[PDB]
Amino acid sequence: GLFDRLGRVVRANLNDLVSKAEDPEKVLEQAVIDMQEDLVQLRQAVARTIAEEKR
Amino acid sequence: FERMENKVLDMEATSQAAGELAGFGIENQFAQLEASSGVEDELAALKAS
Amino acid sequence: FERMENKVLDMEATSQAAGELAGFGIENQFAQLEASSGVEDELAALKAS
Amino acid sequence: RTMSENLRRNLAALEAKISEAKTKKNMLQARAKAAKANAELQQTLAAAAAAAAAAA
Amino acid sequence: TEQRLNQDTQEAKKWEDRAKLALTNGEENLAREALARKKSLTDTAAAYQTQLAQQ
């Protein structure tokens, strides 16, 4: 549709406008912080399912 | 009594699973190897003396 | 009681289907293969030593 | 108990790639400091050549 | 960068020694894990050598 095509244009400009706000030096270490605490959340949920196989 | 027994078995399993899963992971698992400290060469060089 | 049993069976099926479908996909499926890590050549070269 | 094996392997495959990511982060943050220092140097040499005091 | 190079060459020795220790204990699945840690260190050390000679 025409308004799909306009939507994908205006949406892509906004996504590029964000992408050049990303400083490689700051974001590259935050990405590793986020990925580490994701594992802390995951390990809690897994263990909570192990408790029930035991049970 | 029977209702209170199940509460105990829920606590026991919750503790054991969290402890078992933390028993995985490379550092904790390598720490169980005897020669894991990494001075066996200079130890051997000392034993040679 | 019977009305509440059906609610339980609806939850159980909703959880199992979403988990089963996420069990597909190449990465999760390859992660189940034993030699999937991709160092078996240098592992073999080390075993040769 | 066929699911917990799958999850228990997926949990170890994650931490393996965190360790790799963290080693690369150090090498990349080094290269980004070097490249930025050289950019300021090359900008300084251009402005000096643009003033051309030795031609005046 | 010359400091960083001297760490990652001696850190890779630690993981090579631990892999041999695992194989003498027959724990071949743990030996693979150590070898994966080593490879990522020997690949980044080669970047520091290239960077440093250019600098």
Short mmCIF file of N, CA, C and O in Angstrom, two decimals, chain D residues 8-56:
data_model
loop_
_atom_site.label_atom_id
_atom_site.label_comp_id
_atom_site.label_asym_id
_atom_site.label_seq_id
_atom_site.Cartn_x
_atom_site.Cartn_y
_atom_site.Cartn_z
N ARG D 8 20.07 -26.35 30.03
CA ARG D 8 21.38 -26.38 30.67
C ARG D 8 22.53 -26.28 29.68
O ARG D 8 23.59 -25.75 30.03
N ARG D 9 22.36 -26.77 28.45
CA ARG D 9 23.34 -26.49 27.40
C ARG D 9 23.26 -25.06 26.88
O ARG D 9 24.29 -24.42 26.66
N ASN D 10 22.05 -24.55 26.67
CA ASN D 10 21.89 -23.18 26.19
C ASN D 10 22.45 -22.15 27.16
O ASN D 10 22.92 -21.10 26.75
N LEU D 11 22.38 -22.44 28.46
CA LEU D 11 22.94 -21.56 29.47
C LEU D 11 24.46 -21.48 29.41
O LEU D 11 25.04 -20.42 29.66
N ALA D 12 25.13 -22.59 29.11
CA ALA D 12 26.58 -22.58 28.98
C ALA D 12 27.07 -21.96 27.68
O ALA D 12 28.12 -21.30 27.66
N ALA D 13 26.34 -22.16 26.59
CA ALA D 13 26.68 -21.51 25.33
C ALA D 13 26.61 -19.99 25.39
O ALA D 13 27.33 -19.31 24.66
N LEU D 14 25.77 -19.45 26.26
CA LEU D 14 25.70 -18.00 26.43
C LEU D 14 26.96 -17.44 27.08
O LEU D 14 27.58 -16.52 26.54
N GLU D 15 27.35 -17.97 28.23
CA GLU D 15 28.51 -17.44 28.93
C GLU D 15 29.81 -17.61 28.15
O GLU D 15 30.74 -16.82 28.32
N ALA D 16 29.89 -18.63 27.30
CA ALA D 16 31.03 -18.76 26.39
C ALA D 16 31.19 -17.56 25.46
O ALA D 16 32.32 -17.11 25.22
N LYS D 17 30.09 -17.03 24.94
CA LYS D 17 30.17 -15.88 24.05
C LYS D 17 30.23 -14.54 24.76
O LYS D 17 30.64 -13.55 24.15
N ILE D 18 29.82 -14.46 26.02
CA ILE D 18 30.13 -13.27 26.81
C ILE D 18 31.63 -13.13 27.00
O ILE D 18 32.19 -12.03 26.88
N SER D 19 32.31 -14.23 27.30
CA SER D 19 33.75 -14.19 27.51
C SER D 19 34.49 -13.72 26.26
O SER D 19 35.41 -12.90 26.35
N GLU D 20 34.11 -14.23 25.10
CA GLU D 20 34.66 -13.76 23.84
C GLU D 20 34.37 -12.28 23.59
O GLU D 20 35.26 -11.52 23.20
N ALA D 21 33.13 -11.86 23.79
CA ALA D 21 32.78 -10.46 23.61
C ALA D 21 33.62 -9.53 24.48
O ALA D 21 34.07 -8.47 24.03
N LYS D 22 33.84 -9.91 25.73
CA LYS D 22 34.58 -9.07 26.66
C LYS D 22 36.05 -8.95 26.32
O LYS D 22 36.66 -7.91 26.58
N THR D 23 36.65 -9.99 25.74
CA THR D 23 38.03 -9.88 25.27
C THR D 23 38.15 -8.97 24.05
O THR D 23 39.11 -8.21 23.93
N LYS D 24 37.19 -9.04 23.12
CA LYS D 24 37.22 -8.18 21.95
C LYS D 24 36.96 -6.72 22.28
O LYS D 24 37.55 -5.83 21.67
N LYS D 25 36.08 -6.47 23.24
CA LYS D 25 35.81 -5.10 23.67
C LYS D 25 37.09 -4.35 24.00
O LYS D 25 37.24 -3.18 23.63
N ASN D 26 38.01 -4.99 24.70
CA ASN D 26 39.26 -4.34 25.07
C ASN D 26 40.07 -3.93 23.84
O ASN D 26 40.59 -2.81 23.77
N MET D 27 40.19 -4.83 22.87
CA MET D 27 40.94 -4.55 21.65
C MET D 27 40.30 -3.47 20.79
O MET D 27 41.01 -2.68 20.16
N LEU D 28 38.98 -3.42 20.75
CA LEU D 28 38.29 -2.39 19.98
C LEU D 28 38.38 -1.02 20.62
O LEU D 28 38.60 -0.02 19.93
N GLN D 29 38.21 -0.94 21.93
CA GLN D 29 38.34 0.35 22.61
C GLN D 29 39.75 0.92 22.50
O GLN D 29 39.92 2.14 22.53
N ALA D 30 40.75 0.06 22.36
CA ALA D 30 42.10 0.52 22.07
C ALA D 30 42.23 1.15 20.69
O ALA D 30 42.73 2.27 20.54
N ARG D 31 41.76 0.44 19.67
CA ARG D 31 41.78 0.94 18.30
C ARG D 31 41.00 2.23 18.12
O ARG D 31 41.38 3.07 17.30
N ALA D 32 39.90 2.41 18.85
CA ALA D 32 39.14 3.64 18.73
C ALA D 32 39.83 4.85 19.35
O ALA D 32 39.61 5.98 18.91
N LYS D 33 40.65 4.63 20.37
CA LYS D 33 41.46 5.72 20.91
C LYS D 33 42.63 6.09 20.00
O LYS D 33 42.92 7.27 19.80
N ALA D 34 43.31 5.09 19.44
CA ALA D 34 44.38 5.35 18.49
C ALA D 34 43.90 6.10 17.26
O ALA D 34 44.52 7.08 16.83
N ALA D 35 42.79 5.66 16.67
CA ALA D 35 42.28 6.30 15.47
C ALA D 35 41.87 7.74 15.71
O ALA D 35 42.01 8.59 14.82
N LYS D 36 41.35 8.04 16.89
CA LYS D 36 40.92 9.39 17.21
C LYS D 36 42.08 10.34 17.49
O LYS D 36 42.00 11.53 17.16
N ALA D 37 43.15 9.84 18.09
CA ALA D 37 44.37 10.62 18.24
C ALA D 37 45.02 10.98 16.91
O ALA D 37 45.46 12.11 16.72
N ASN D 38 45.08 10.02 15.99
CA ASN D 38 45.59 10.30 14.65
C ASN D 38 44.72 11.24 13.84
O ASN D 38 45.24 11.99 13.01
N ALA D 39 43.41 11.22 14.04
CA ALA D 39 42.55 12.17 13.36
C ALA D 39 42.82 13.61 13.78
O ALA D 39 42.83 14.51 12.94
N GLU D 40 43.05 13.84 15.07
CA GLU D 40 43.40 15.18 15.54
C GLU D 40 44.76 15.64 15.05
O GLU D 40 44.94 16.82 14.73
N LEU D 41 45.73 14.73 14.98
CA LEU D 41 47.03 15.07 14.41
C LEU D 41 46.94 15.48 12.95
O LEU D 41 47.48 16.52 12.55
N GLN D 42 46.26 14.68 12.13
CA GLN D 42 46.17 15.00 10.71
C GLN D 42 45.39 16.28 10.45
O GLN D 42 45.64 16.96 9.46
N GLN D 43 44.45 16.62 11.33
CA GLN D 43 43.78 17.90 11.24
C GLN D 43 44.69 19.07 11.60
O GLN D 43 44.53 20.17 11.05
N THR D 44 45.62 18.86 12.52
CA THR D 44 46.55 19.91 12.90
C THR D 44 47.54 20.24 11.79
O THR D 44 47.82 21.41 11.52
N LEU D 45 48.08 19.21 11.14
CA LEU D 45 48.99 19.41 10.02
C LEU D 45 48.34 20.10 8.83
O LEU D 45 49.01 20.84 8.11
N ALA D 46 47.06 19.86 8.61
CA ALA D 46 46.36 20.55 7.53
C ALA D 46 46.20 22.04 7.80
O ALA D 46 46.47 22.87 6.92
N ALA D 47 45.77 22.41 9.00
CA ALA D 47 45.60 23.82 9.32
C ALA D 47 46.92 24.58 9.29
O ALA D 47 46.95 25.75 8.90
N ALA D 48 48.01 23.95 9.71
CA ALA D 48 49.32 24.57 9.60
C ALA D 48 49.70 24.84 8.15
O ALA D 48 50.15 25.94 7.81
N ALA D 49 49.51 23.85 7.28
CA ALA D 49 49.79 24.03 5.86
C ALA D 49 48.85 25.03 5.21
O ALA D 49 49.20 25.64 4.20
N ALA D 50 47.65 25.21 5.76
CA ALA D 50 46.73 26.21 5.25
C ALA D 50 47.11 27.63 5.65
O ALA D 50 46.82 28.57 4.90
N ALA D 51 47.75 27.81 6.80
CA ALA D 51 48.22 29.15 7.16
C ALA D 51 49.44 29.55 6.34
O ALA D 51 49.56 30.71 5.94
N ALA D 52 50.35 28.61 6.07
CA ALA D 52 51.47 28.84 5.16
C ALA D 52 52.22 30.12 5.54
O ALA D 52 52.46 31.00 4.71
N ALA D 53 52.57 30.22 6.82
CA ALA D 53 53.34 31.35 7.31
C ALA D 53 54.70 31.47 6.64
O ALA D 53 55.21 32.58 6.46
N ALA D 54 55.29 30.34 6.25
CA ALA D 54 56.58 30.35 5.58
C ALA D 54 56.51 30.87 4.15
O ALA D 54 57.54 31.26 3.60
N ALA D 55 55.33 30.87 3.54
CA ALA D 55 55.17 31.52 2.25
C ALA D 55 55.02 33.03 2.37
O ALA D 55 55.52 33.78 1.53
N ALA D 56 54.34 33.49 3.42
CA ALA D 56 54.24 34.93 3.66
C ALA D 56 55.59 35.53 3.98
O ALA D 56 55.89 36.66 3.58
#
